[PDB]
Amino acid sequence: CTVRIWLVNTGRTEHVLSGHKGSVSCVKWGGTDLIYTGSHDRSVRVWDAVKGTLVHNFTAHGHWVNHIALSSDHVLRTAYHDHTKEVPGTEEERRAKAKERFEKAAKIKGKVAERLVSASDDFTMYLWDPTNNGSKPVARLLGHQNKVNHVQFSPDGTLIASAGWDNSTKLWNARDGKFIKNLRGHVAPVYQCAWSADSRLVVTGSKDCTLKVWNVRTGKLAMDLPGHEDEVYAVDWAADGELVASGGKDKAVRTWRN
C-alpha cells in the first residue's frame, strides 16, 4: 500500500507515499513533479513529489483501480528523443527540448494541464483534470460491459483507447469523455492496447492469443496478427512505429513489422 521514491545514484529512499488502504496497482510520474497512484482501495491519489505530500484524493470508483494514464505519457517516456534522431549537444538543451515536448503535449486551452484517466473494475473510467476541475471529474466513461483492464491516451491527445474484459476495445473523445466507436474483433478479454505514433492505429493484445491492429478513423480492423500459442500479456508499439512487440504465456518474444 505504499509508493517509494528512490534516488538512483545512491539507491536510498527519499519519500514514502502512504495512505492507501489497498495495494497500489499503478503509478505515474507527470511533467510537473506530481505522482499519480491508483489503488485497490478504489482511490486515485495525486502527490507532490518534491515534498512527498498528498495533494488530491479521488474516491469515485466503485471497485479496484486497475490502470491510470496521463495525457503526456508518450512524450514523458521518450524525453528529448523524437523523429529527428539528432540529440541536442548539452544537458541544458536536452532538458529544454524534453520540457518543450511535454508542454506541447500537455497544453489545454493554452495552459499546461495534464489530464488523467483511470480504468476500474466497476466497468467504468473516470477522466480528471486536477488543475482546472480539481476533485470534480471531467467525465465518467460508460459503456464497457465488464472490467476495464487497460487505458491509454493517443499521442495527439484527441482520443482515448480502452481495453476491457468484455472482449472489446472502445474509443472515446479525450476532451469531454464521449463515446465514439466500439472495436469488436476479439473473442476473449483484451488485456493490453498501444497507440501508434501518428495516432491512426491501435494494437490490442488479448487472451485469445491474438494481436489486432485497428484503424481508428474508419473504426475497422486493419490487421489481424495470429501466431501466439497462448495468452498475450504484454504489448508495446515502438515510438518510431517500426515494430510492435508482444509477449505472454508461450514464453517467446514476438516482433511484428509492416
Binding site: 478504489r42 466503485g62 471497485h63 473494475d121 466497476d122 466497468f123 460508460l142
Partner: protein, 59 residues
C-alpha cells in the same frame, strides 16, 4: 451495469462487515451531501410517499 451492481456491492462490502457482531461499517451511504439537499430530499420523499399512499387507496 445493473446486472452486476449487486455482486459489485457485495464484493466491495461483505455482509459480515456491514452489520453484525464483527461489523466495521461506520459511514452510511447517503443520496445527499448538504443540509439544504437533505431538507429538499425529505420534502420530495414525503410528497412521493403521500402520492403512493393515495394511489394505493384509490386502487
Amino acid at each position: 451495469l445493473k446486472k452486476h451492481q449487486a455482486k459489485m456491492t457485495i464484493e466491495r462490502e461483505p455482509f459480515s462487515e456491514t452489520f453484525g457482531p464483527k461489523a466495521q461499517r461506520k459511514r452510511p451511504k447517503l443520496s445527499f451531501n448538504t443540509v439544504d439537499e437533505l431538507a429538499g430530499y425529505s420534502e420530495q420523499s414525503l410528497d412521493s410517499y403521500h402520492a403512493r399512499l393515495e394511489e394505493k387507496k384509490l386502487l
